[PDB]
A paper describes a structure:
Major histocompatibility complex (MHC) class I molecules bind peptides in the lumen of the endoplasmic reticulum and present tightly binding (high-affinity) peptides on the cell surface for recognition by cytotoxic T cells. To better understand the peptide-binding process to MHC class I, we have recently stabilized class I molecules by the introduction of a disulfide bond between the alpha helices in the vicinity of the F pocket. Until now, the study of the dynamic processes that accompany peptide binding has been hindered by the lack of a crystal structure of the peptide-free form of class I. In this paper, we present such a structure for the disulfide-stabilized form of HLA-A*02:01, and we describe the concerted conformational changes of the amino-acid side chains lining the class I peptide-binding groove that occur when a peptide binds. We find that both the A and F pockets contain side chain triads that undergo such concerted changes.
As the peptide-free dsA2 characterized above did not yield crystals, we used dsA2/GM crystals and vacated the peptide-binding groove of the GM dipeptide. To do this, we first alternated between crystal washing in cryobuffer (lacking dipeptide) and crystal cryo-cooling to 100 K (an “annealing” protocol). After two cycles of washing and cryo-cooling, we obtained a crystal structure of dsA2 at 1.75 Å resolution that is devoid of any amino acids in the peptide-binding groove (dsA2/peptide_free-1). There is one molecule of EDO in the A pocket, which mimics the N-terminal amino group and the peptide backbone conformation. The lack of peptide in the A pocket of dsA2 is accompanied by an interesting conformational change of some side chains. In the empty structure, the side chain of Tyr99 on the β-sheet floor of the peptide-binding groove has changed its conformation to point further into the A pocket, away from His70 on the α1 helix. There is no longer a hydrogen bond network connecting these residues, and the closest distance between His70 and Tyr99 is 4.3 Å. The side chain of Phe9, which is also situated on the β sheet floor, has turned perpendicular to the peptide-loaded conformation, and now fills the space vacated by the side chain of His70. We propose to call this peptide-receptive conformation the unlocked state of the A pocket, defined by the release of the hydrogen bond between His70 and Tyr99 and the upward movement of the side chain of Phe9. In the F pocket of the dsA2/peptide_free-1 structure, there is an EDO molecule that sits deep inside the pocket where the methionine side chain is situated in the dsA2/GM2 structure, but the conformation of the Arg97-His114-Tyr116 triad is the same as in the dsA2/peptide_free-2 structure.
Author numbering:
A (entry chain A): 1 to 275
B (entry chain B): 1 to 100
Write the structure that this text describes.
Amino acid sequence: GSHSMRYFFTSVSRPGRGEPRFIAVGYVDDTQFVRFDSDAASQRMEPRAPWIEQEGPEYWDGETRKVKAHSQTHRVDLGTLRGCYNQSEAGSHTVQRMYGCDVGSDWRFLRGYHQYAYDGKDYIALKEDLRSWTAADMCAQTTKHKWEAAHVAEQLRAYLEGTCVEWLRRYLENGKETLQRTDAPKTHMTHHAVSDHEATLRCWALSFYPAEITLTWQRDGEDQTQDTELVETRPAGDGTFQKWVAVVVPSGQEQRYTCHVQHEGLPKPLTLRWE
Amino acid sequence: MIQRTPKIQVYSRHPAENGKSNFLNCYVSGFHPSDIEVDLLKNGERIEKVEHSDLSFSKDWSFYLLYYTEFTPTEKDEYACRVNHVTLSQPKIVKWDRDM
Ligand code: NA
C-alpha cells in the first residue's frame, strides 16, 4: 500500500536558561527511526529503529551536520518571530516544522508537505503544488515575501519529490519486516456495571499496526458518536497500537449496542455484538 | 498564548496477570506548550527508572509522549501516572485500572 516519511522539528526558547532546545525526529509511516536532541551529550543524530542501524558513518555524519544546521536556522527564527510579534525577551516560544513525502502503492511520489507553526498555530505552509505558500498572519506574509524572492519553494520541492522518496524506498526494503506488515486488531468488548441502573460498554482493539483504525458504537443500527468516549490511539510499546470506545447505557439495553471496527488487516469491517 | 490540556492514559502493554512482568505505559497526548512533567507511581512513589519517547507532535501541532517502565502487577500494588502542565492548577493523578 501507500507509505510516508515525515520529519518533525521542535524548537523552544528558554531565555536565561541557555540556548533554545531543538528536538528532531524522523518517521516512516507510524515507526520512528531517528532522533536528535540538542540537550543530549552525544550531539549526534541517533538510530531509533533496528533497520536504520546498518547505515554507514557518512549517513550519520551527513544527518548530524544537516540537523545541526537546521537547529541554527531555527535559533535565529525565534529572534525574527519574537521581533515581528513584538513579544517580550523573557517568554518561552515554540517553533515547529514538519515535512516529508507520501508515495502510493507503486512507491512513486504522490504528495509533499513542508509546514511551520509558531506557538501552536499555523504560521506558514507549502501548498500541495509545492510552489506557493499559505501564510495567515501578517508576520508570516513577511516571511512569504522573503521566501518568494529567494525561490525557497523550488529547493524544498526538489528534496520532497526526489531525495525524500529515494530514501523512503530504501527504508521500506531495509525495514520490510517492520514496515511492510499489517497486524490485524484483536477485538472484544467489556461490560462493567457503574451502578444498579447503568453499565459501561467498552469496545477494544489491541495489538494492531498501522495505527489507522475506526471504532464506532451503534444503538439499534444508529451511530452513537455524540455519546461515545473515544480515546486517542496509543502505542503498546512493542510497535503495535491500542484503542477503545465506550458508551454508558441503561442496564438491560446491552443487546441494542454493537461495536464496529475497520482496519486494513481486516478482510471486512467487523461487528461485535452482545450475542 | 495557546495552551492545550494533556490527555492522559495509563495502561499495560499486555493484559495484566498478577506476578507476571509487563510494561506500564503513561501516554500523554494533545498538549501545548511542550514542557510537561510525567511520573509513573507505585504505591504513591515515583518510579526512578522510567523511560520516555522522543518529543513528537500530531497534525494539529499538539505534542505527544510515551512514558514507560517494566512492572509486575500484583493484587495489592497501586500504580498510577502523575502529570503536571501549565494548563493544570495542580498535578493530575490517573490510577491504573486493569479491569477496563
Ligand atoms: Na500546572
